[PDB]
Amino acid sequence: ILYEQDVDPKVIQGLKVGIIGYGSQGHAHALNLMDSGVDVRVGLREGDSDWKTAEEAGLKVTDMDTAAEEADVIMVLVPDEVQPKVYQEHIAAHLKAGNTLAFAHGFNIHYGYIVPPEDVNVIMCAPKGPGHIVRRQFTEGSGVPDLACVQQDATGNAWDIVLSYCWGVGGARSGIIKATFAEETEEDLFGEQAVLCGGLVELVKAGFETLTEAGYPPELAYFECYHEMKMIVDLMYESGIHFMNYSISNTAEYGEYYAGPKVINEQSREAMKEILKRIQDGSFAQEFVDDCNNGHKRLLEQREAINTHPIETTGAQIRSMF
Amino acid sequence: MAVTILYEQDVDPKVIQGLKVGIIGYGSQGHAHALNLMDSGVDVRVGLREGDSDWKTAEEAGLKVTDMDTAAEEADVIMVLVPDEVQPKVYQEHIAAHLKAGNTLAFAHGFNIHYGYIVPPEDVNVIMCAPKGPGHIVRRQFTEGSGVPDLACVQQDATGNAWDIVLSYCWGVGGARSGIIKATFAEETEEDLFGEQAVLCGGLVELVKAGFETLTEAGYPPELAYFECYHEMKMIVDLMYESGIHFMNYSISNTAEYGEYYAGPKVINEQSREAMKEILKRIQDGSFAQEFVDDCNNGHKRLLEQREAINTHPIETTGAQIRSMFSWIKKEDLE
Numbered sequence: 001i002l003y004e005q006d007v008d009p010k011v012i013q014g015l016k017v018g019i020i021g022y023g024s025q026g027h028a029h030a031l032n033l034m035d036s037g038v039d040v041r042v043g044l045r046e047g048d049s050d051w052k053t054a055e056e057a058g059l060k061v062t063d064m065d066t067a068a069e070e071a072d073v074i075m076v077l078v079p080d081e082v083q084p085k086v087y088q089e090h091i092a093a094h095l096k097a098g099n100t101l102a103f104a105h106g107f108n109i110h111y112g113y114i115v116p117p118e119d120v121n122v123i124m125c126a127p128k129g130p131g132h133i134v135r136r137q138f139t140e141g142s143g144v145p146d147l148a149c150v151q152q153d154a155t156g157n158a159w160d161i162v163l164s165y166c167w168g169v170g171g172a173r174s175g176i177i178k179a180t181f182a183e184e185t186e187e188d189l190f191g192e193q194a195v196l197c198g199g200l201v202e203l204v205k206a207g208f209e210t211l212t213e214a215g216y217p218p219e220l221a222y223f224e225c226y227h228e229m230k231m232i233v234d235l236m237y238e239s240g241i242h243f244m245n246y247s248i249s250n251t252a253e254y255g256e257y258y259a260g261p262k263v264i265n266e267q268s269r270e271a272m273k274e275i276l277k278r279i280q281d282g283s284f285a286q287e288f289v290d291d292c293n294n295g296h297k298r299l300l301e302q303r304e305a306i307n308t309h310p311i312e313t314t315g316a317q318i319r320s321m322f
Numbered sequence: 323m324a325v326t327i328l329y330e331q332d333v334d335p336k337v338i339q340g341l342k343v344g345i346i347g348y349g350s351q352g353h354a355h356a357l358n359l360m361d362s363g364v365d366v367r368v369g370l371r372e373g374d375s376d377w378k379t380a381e382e383a384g385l386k387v388t389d390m391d392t393a394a395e396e397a398d399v400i401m402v403l404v405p406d407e408v409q410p411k412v413y414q415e416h417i418a419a420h421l422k423a424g425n426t427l428a429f430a431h432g433f434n435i436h437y438g439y440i441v442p443p444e445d446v447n448v449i450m451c452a453p454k455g456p457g458h459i460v461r462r463q464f465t466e467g468s469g470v471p472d473l474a475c476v477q478q479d480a481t482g483n484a485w486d487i488v489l490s491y492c493w494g495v496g497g498a499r500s501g502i503i504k505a506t507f508a509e510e511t512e513e514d515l516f517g518e519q520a521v522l523c524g525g526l527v528e529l530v531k532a533g534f535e536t537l538t539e540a541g542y543p544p545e546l547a548y549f550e551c552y553h554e555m556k557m558i559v560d561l562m563y564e565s566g567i568h569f570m571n572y573s574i575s576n577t578a579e580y581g582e583y584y585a586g587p588k589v590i591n592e593q594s595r596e597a598m599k600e601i602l603k604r605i606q607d608g609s610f611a612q613e614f615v616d617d618c619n620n621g622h623k624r625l626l627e628q629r630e631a632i633n634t635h636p637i638e639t640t641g642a643q644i645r646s647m648f649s650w651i652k653k654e655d656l657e
C-alpha cells in the first residue's frame with residue numbers, strides 16, 4: 001500500500017485536468033483536484049442543471065469537446081453505460097499523442113467497450129467510496145482509498161501521473177493500491193453487489209420487514225434495523241470487529257455468532273461465488289448493458305419498489321424531525 | 323397514532339435532575355449513561371466492585387465513584403448496567419437490600435425482567451431506558467449535540483410518576499434529540515434481541531466477513547478485500563442514515579445500483595428470510611434466552627470460542643494493520 005511519501009504532488013499540479021461529468025464522482029474529483037492546486041475544467045452538456053452548481057462551486061465549466069481539447073488528462077465521470085458513445089462523440093477527436101485518458105472504474109476498458117488509441121496513456125484512479133464521501137472525507141482532512149491502474153503506458157510516466165492524481169483526490173491519506181483494470185473491475189462489481197449495496201440494503205430491508213410483518217411498529221423497526229446500523233459500522237470502521245463486539249453486550253455478541261451464519265448462510269456464500277463468476281466471465285456486464293439499451297427498464301422498476309417501500313417513507317418522516 | 327415519537331417538548335428535564343442516579347457498572351452503556359446524565363445536570367454516582375480497574379477510568383472522567391452497595395443505598399434511581407447474565411446475582415447480592423419504598427429500579431434492556439430472571443419488589447418503580455445504539459456512540463453523539471434514540475418502558479408504576487422519570491431519564495442521555503418511543507418491556511426485549519441478531523451484529527458481521535472471504539478465496543489480496551468489503555461500508559451506511567436509500571442509490575453509479583437490485587435477493591435470500599423468522603420465534607418463546615444463559619453458566623463456552631476466532635481472523639489482523647496507517651489515526655496519535 002502507498003501513502004503520501006510514495007507519490008509526487010507536483011506531477012498532477014503541472015497537468016491540466018478535464019473532468020467529463022459532474023455527478024457523484026465528477027464533483028468530488030473536480031473539487032478535490034482544484035483544492036489540491038490542480039488546473040481543472042468540467043466538461044458538460046448544454047442544458048445540464050448542474051452547470052450553474054459546478055460554476056457556483058468556483059470551477060471553470062465548458063462543453064465536453066472543449067474540456068477534452070484543453071486537457072492533458074481527461075477523466076471520464078459519466079455513467080459507465082454512456083461512456084462509449086460519449087468517448088466517440090466528444091472525447092476521441094480531442095486526444096493528442098501524450099494525453100492521458102483516465103477512468104474511475106475499469107469496466108469499459110476491461111470488457112472492451114472502449115479501445116483507446118495506442119498513443120495515449122490509459123489509467124484509472126478508482127476511489128473505494130461514494131463520490132459525496134470522496135468529497136467529504138477530503139474536506140475533513142481524511143481521504144477515500146484508491147486503486148491506481150495503468151492499462152497503457154504510452155508516455156513511460158503514466159504511473160507517476162495516476163499516483164499524483166490519487167494524491168489529488170485524497171487517496172494517499174488512507175491508501176493507494178496498485179491494481180490492474182481486470183482486478184479493479186472484478187473486485188468493485190463484487191463489493192457493490194454482494195456486500196455494500198445489494199447485500200446491505202436487502203439485509204436491512206429483510207429485518208425491517210420481518211419485524212413489521214410480526215406486528216412491531218415500522219418506526220421501531222427503522223431505529224433498530226436501519227438507523228442504528230450507522231453506529232455499529234462506525235465502531236468497526238475506526239477500531240475493528242473486536243472493538244465493536246466488545247462494545248455490544250455479551251447477549252448481543254452471543255446472538256451475533258449464533259444468528260450471523262443463519263442469516264448469511266451457506267447459500268449466501270454460494271451466491272457470492274456465483275456473483276463473482278458472472279463478474280469474471282463478462283455475463284453480468286452484458287446483462288447490465290442490455291438493460292441500459294432497454295432504457296434502464298429493470299433498474300427503474302426496482303428503483304420504484306425501493307423508493308415506495310415503507311422503510312423509505314417511514315425513514316423520510318423520522319429523519320425530517322432530527 | 324401507533325406510534326408517537328416523543329421529543330424534547332414531550333419530556334420534563336427537571337424530574338431526573340431532581341433525583342439521585344446510581345449507575346451500577348461502567349462498561350459500554352454504564353459510561354455513556356453516567357457521563358451524559360452528569361453533563362445534563364443530574365446527581366450521578368457510579369457503583370463498582372472494590373478494586374475494579376475501571377474505577378480510576380470513571381474518576382478520570384470526573385464522576386463520583388463508590389462501591390455498588392453504597393451507590394444503590396444513596397440512589398433514588400438504580401440503573402442496572404452490568405452484563406445481562408450477571409444481573410440476577412449482582413441484584414440479589416448488592417442491589418435489592420438497598421431499595422427503599424418509592425425508589426426506581428432501571429434497566430437499559432428488558433431481558434431479565436421480561437423473562438423473569440429478576441422479580442423486583444412491589445414498592446419500587448420498574449422502568450427502562452433502552453438506547454437503540456452502542457454505549458460508545460450513545461456517548462459520542464450526545465457530545466456532538468445529537469443523541470441515540472431511546473425506548474422508554476415502565477413495568478411497574480409504583481409511585482405514579484414512573485413515566486415522567488423514564489421520559490426524563492431518556493432526555494438526560496440524549497434520546498429527545500432523535501426520538502423516544504414508548505414500548506413495553508416485552509416489546510423492547512423482543513425487537514432488540516432480533517435487531518442485534520438478524521441485522522446489526524450477526525447479519526452485518528457475517529455479511530462483511532463472507533464478502534472478504536469470497537474475495538480472498540478467489541485470490542484478491544486481503545488488503546483490497548478489506549477496502550472493498552469492510553472500509554467502504556461506513557460510507558454507504560452514512561448516506562442511508564443521513565438521507566435514505568433513495569439518495570445512497572442516487573450517489574452510487576447505475577452499474578452499482580443495477581447490481582444492488584440484482585444481487586440483494588441472492589445474498590439475502592429466502593433461507594435468510596426463513597432464518598429471521600425462526601430467529602424471531604426463538605426470541606419470543608424464550609428459547610434463545612435459555613440458550614444464552616446456559617452458555618454463560620457453562621464457561622461462556624460458545625461465546626469465547628467464537629470471540630477468539632473472529633478476533634484473530636485475517637479481516638481483523640489486516641484491518642488493524644491497514645487502519646494503523648491512516649493519516650488521521652497517525653494525526654490523532656500525535657495529538
Ligand SMILES: NC(=O)c1ccc[n+]([C@@H]2O[C@H](COP(=O)([O-])OP(=O)(O)OC[C@H]3O[C@@H](n4cnc5c(N)ncnc54)[C@H](O)[C@@H]3O)[C@@H](O)[C@H]2O)c1
Nearest residue numbers: 021022023024025077078079082104105130131573574575
Ligand atoms: N461514487 C460512485 O458512484 C462511483 C464510485 C467509484 C467509481 N465510480 C465510477 O465513476 C464513473 C461515474 O460514476 P458516477 O456514478 O459519479 O456517475 P453519475 O451517474 O453521477 O453521472 C452523472 C454525470 O454524468 C453526466 N451525464 C449523464 N449522461 C450523460 C451523457 N449521455 N453525456 C454526457 N454527460 C452525461 C450527468 O449530466 C452528470 O454530470 C463511472 O465509471 C463509475 O463506475 C462511481
Ligand SMILES: NC(=O)c1ccc[n+]([C@@H]2O[C@H](COP(=O)([O-])OP(=O)(O)OC[C@H]3O[C@@H](n4cnc5c(N)ncnc54)[C@H](O)[C@@H]3O)[C@@H](O)[C@H]2O)c1
Nearest residue numbers: 247248249347348349350351403404405408430431456457
Ligand atoms: N451498547 C450496548 O452494549 C447496549 C445497548 C443497549 C442495551 N444494553 C444493555 O445494557 C446493559 C449492560 O450492557 P453493557 O454491554 O454496557 O455491559 P458491559 O458488558 O459493558 O458491562 C461491563 C461492566 O459491568 C461490570 N460487571 C461485569 N460483571 C460483573 C459482576 N459479576 N458484578 C459486578 N459488576 C460486573 C464490569 O466490572 C463493567 O463495569 C445490558 O442490560 C445490555 O443488554 C447494552
Ligand SMILES: CC(C)N(O)C(=O)C(=O)O
Nearest residue numbers: 129130192196574575578
Ligand atoms: C459507491 C460504491 C458502492 N462504489 O464503490 C462504486 O464503485 C459504484 O458506485 O459503482
Ligand SMILES: CC(C)N(O)C(=O)C(=O)O
Nearest residue numbers: 248249252455456518522
Ligand atoms: C447492537 C448493540 C449496540 N445493541 O443495540 C444492543 O442491544 C446490545 O449491545 O445488547
Ligand SMILES: [Mg+2]
Nearest residue numbers: 128129188192
Ligand atoms: Mg466501488
Ligand SMILES: [Mg+2]
Nearest residue numbers: 105188192578
Ligand atoms: Mg463501482
Ligand SMILES: [Mg+2]
Nearest residue numbers: 246247248350
Ligand atoms: Mg459491552
Ligand SMILES: [Mg+2]
Nearest residue numbers: 248249250253
Ligand atoms: Mg460483548
Ligand SMILES: [Mg+2]
Nearest residue numbers: 349350351352
Ligand atoms: Mg455498562
Ligand SMILES: [Mg+2]
Nearest residue numbers: 394395397420
Ligand atoms: Mg436507595
Ligand SMILES: [Mg+2]
Nearest residue numbers: 454455514518
Ligand atoms: Mg439494541
Ligand SMILES: [Mg+2]
Nearest residue numbers: 252514515518
Ligand atoms: Mg441488546
Ligand SMILES: [Mg+2]
Nearest residue numbers: 024572573574
Ligand atoms: Mg451517481
Ligand SMILES: [Mg+2]
Nearest residue numbers: 574575576579
Ligand atoms: Mg445510481
